[PDB]
Amino acid sequence: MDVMNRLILAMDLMNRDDALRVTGEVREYIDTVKIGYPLVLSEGMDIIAEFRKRFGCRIIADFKVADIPETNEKICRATFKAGADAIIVHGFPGADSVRACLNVAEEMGREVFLLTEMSHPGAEMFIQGAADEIARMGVDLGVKNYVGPSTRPERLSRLREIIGQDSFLISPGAGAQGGDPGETLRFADAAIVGRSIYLADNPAAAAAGIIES
Amino acid sequence: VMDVMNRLILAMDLMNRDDALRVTGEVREYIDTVKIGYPLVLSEGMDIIAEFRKRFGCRIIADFKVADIPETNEKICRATFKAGADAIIVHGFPGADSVRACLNVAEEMGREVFLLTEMSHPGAEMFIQGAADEIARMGVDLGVKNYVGPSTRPERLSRLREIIGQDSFLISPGAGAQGGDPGETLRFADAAIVGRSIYLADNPAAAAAGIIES
Numbered sequence: 026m027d028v029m030n031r032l033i034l035a036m037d038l039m040n041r042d043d044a045l046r047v048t049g050e051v052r053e054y055i056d057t058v059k060i061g062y063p064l065v066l067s068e069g070m071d072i073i074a075e076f077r078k079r080f081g082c083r084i085i086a087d088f089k090v091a092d093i094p095e096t097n098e099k100i101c102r103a104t105f106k107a108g109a110d111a112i113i114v115h116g117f118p119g120a121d122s123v124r125a126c127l128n129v130a131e132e133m134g135r136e137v138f139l140l141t142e143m144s145h146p147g148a149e150m151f152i153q154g155a156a157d158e159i160a161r162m163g164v165d166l167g168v169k170n171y172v173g174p175s176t177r178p179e180r181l182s183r184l185r186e187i188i189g190q191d192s193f194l195i196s197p198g199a200g201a202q203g204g205d206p207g208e209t210l211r212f213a214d215a216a217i218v219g220r221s222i223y224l225a226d227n228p229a230a231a232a233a234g235i236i237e238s
Numbered sequence: 239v240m241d242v243m244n245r246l247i248l249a250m251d252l253m254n255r256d257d258a259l260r261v262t263g264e265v266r267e268y269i270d271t272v273k274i275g276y277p278l279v280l281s282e283g284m285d286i287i288a289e290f291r292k293r294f295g296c297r298i299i300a301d302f303k304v305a306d307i308p309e310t311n312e313k314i315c316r317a318t319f320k321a322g323a324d325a326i327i328v329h330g331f332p333g334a335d336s337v338r339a340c341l342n343v344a345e346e347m348g349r350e351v352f353l354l355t356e357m358s359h360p361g362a363e364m365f366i367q368g369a370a371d372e373i374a375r376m377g378v379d380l381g382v383k384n385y386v387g388p389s390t391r392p393e394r395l396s397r398l399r400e401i402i403g404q405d406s407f408l409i410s411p412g413a414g415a416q417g418g419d420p421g422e423t424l425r426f427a428d429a430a431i432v433g434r435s436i437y438l439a440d441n442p443a444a445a446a447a448g449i450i451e452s
C-alpha cells in the first residue's frame with residue numbers, strides 16, 4: 026500500500042457536514058482516511074462511498090471486528106460492498122475469526138488490518154499479554170497489514186520485529202493520547218491522528234504542523 | 239433485572255429489512271426480546287432499531303461487541319442508545335476503562351450494558367478463554383449486572399454463573415447451529431440466544447415453537 030505523508034486521518038466526528046468539511050481541509054496532506062463506527066453509525070454506511078467519490082481517498086473501515094467467524098464474514102462483506110478499501114479486525118477472538126475476514130478480503134480484492142495491541146491504559150489488562158502471540162498468529166496466516174500502539178514505542182518496536190520489514194504497520198495514539206508521531210514512525214509506516222486534527226481550530230494548520238515536526 | 243419472554247432471544251442476523259422484519263414478526267408471539275447486530279445494522283441502517291421497537295414492541299439488544307478505546311466506546315454507545323437500543327453488548331477484553339466508558343453512557347441515558355466474557359466459537363480458546371474468569375470478575379467489581387457467556391461450553395457457563403452470582407442476568411449464544419443445547423444452557427443462563435436455527439428455518443415460527451417445546 027502507498028500512503029501520502031505517513032499520516033492517516035482518524036475521522037471520528039459524528040455529523041456528515043463537519044466530517045466532510047474537515048477532511049476536505051486536510052485533503053492536500055492525506056490520501057488515506059480511517060473511518061470508524063462513530064461516523065458510520067451516525068450517518069450511515071453510504072458515507073464511505075461519499076468520502077471516496079468526493080476526495081478520491083483510500084478508506085480504512087475501523088470496525089475492530091471481534092465476532093464469531095460467521096458474523097465476521099457478514100460484517101466484512103457489508104463493509105467491502107460499501108466501498109471500504111480495508112477493514113481493521115481484532116486478533117483476540119482467535120485465528121478462525123481472523124481467517125473469516127481474510128477470506129472475504131480475498132474474495133473481494135480488499136485488505137485486512139490486524140489489530141495486535143491497543144493504545145489505551147486498559148490495554149495492559151488482557152491485550153498486552155496476548156499481543157505478541159496475536160501478531161505471530163497474523164504473520165503465520167499471511168496477514169500483511171497491522172495496527173499497533175503509538176503510546177508504547179517499545180511495544181511498537183517488538184511488533185515490528187515480529188512482523189518484519191515487508192509488512193505494513195499503522196499506529197494510533199499519537200497526539201491526544203500522548204504519542205509522538207516522529208517517534209512512532211521509527212517503527213510504524215504511518216501514524217494515525219484524530220482529535221489533534223479534527224478538534225483543532227484550524228485542522229489544516231494542525232496537519233501542517235504534524236507534518237513539519 | 240429485565241424480563242424476557244420464554245427465556246429465548248432471537249439473534250436477527252438476516253441482512254435485508256424485508257426478511258428480517260417478516261421473520262421477526264412471525265416468531266413474535268414467542269419472543270419480546272430481539273438481538274440485532276452489525277450484519278443487519280450495517281446493511282439497512284441504524285434506523286432499523288426503532289423500526290423493530292415500533293413494529294413489534296420488543297426490547298432490542300444491540301450486539302455491537304464494543305471493543306475500542308474509552309473515548310470511542312462512549313461515542314458508539316451514545317449513537318446506539320440515541321437510535322433506541324435498550325442495551326448494548328460490550329467486550330471485556332479491552333479492559334476496565336473501556337467497559338466503564340460504556341457504563342457511563344448507559345447510566346446517563348438510562349439503558350443497559352451487557353458484558354461479553356467468553357465467546358462460543360473455537361478460536362475463543364486461544365486468548366479469550368484464559369481471560370474469561372478475570373473479565374467476569376472485573377465486571378462484577380464494576381457493578382455490571384448483565385453478562386453474555388457461551389452455550390457451547392456448559393462447564394465454562396457454570397463457572398461464569400458462580401462468579402456473577404444468582405442476581406446477575408446471563409444470556410448465552412451458541413445454541414442450535416453452533417451445537418449448544420437450549421435446555422442445558424438454561425441450567426446456568428437466564429436466556430438462550432438463537433439465530434440460524436430459527437431465521438434459516440423453512441418455518442421460523444415452527445422452529446421457535448419446537449425450541450420452546452424442548
Ligand SMILES: O=c1cc(O)n([C@@H]2O[C@H](COP(=O)(O)O)[C@@H](O)[C@H]2O)c(=O)[nH]1
Binds near residue numbers: 037197198201202306
Ligand atoms: O489501539 C487503538 C486502536 C484504534 O483503532 N484506535 C482508534 O484510533 C483513533 C485515535 O484517535 P485520536 O488521535 O483522537 O486519539 C480512534 O478513532 C480510535 O478509536 C485507538 O485510538 N487505539
Ligand SMILES: O=c1cc(O)n([C@@H]2O[C@H](COP(=O)(O)O)[C@@H](O)[C@H]2O)c(=O)[nH]1
Binds near residue numbers: 356358388431
Ligand atoms: O460468544 C459469542 C457472542 C455472540 O454475541 N455471538 C452471536 O450470537 C449469534 C449466534 O447466532 P447463531 O444461533 O446463528 O449461531 C450471532 O448473532 C453472533 O454474532 C455468538 O454466536 N457467540
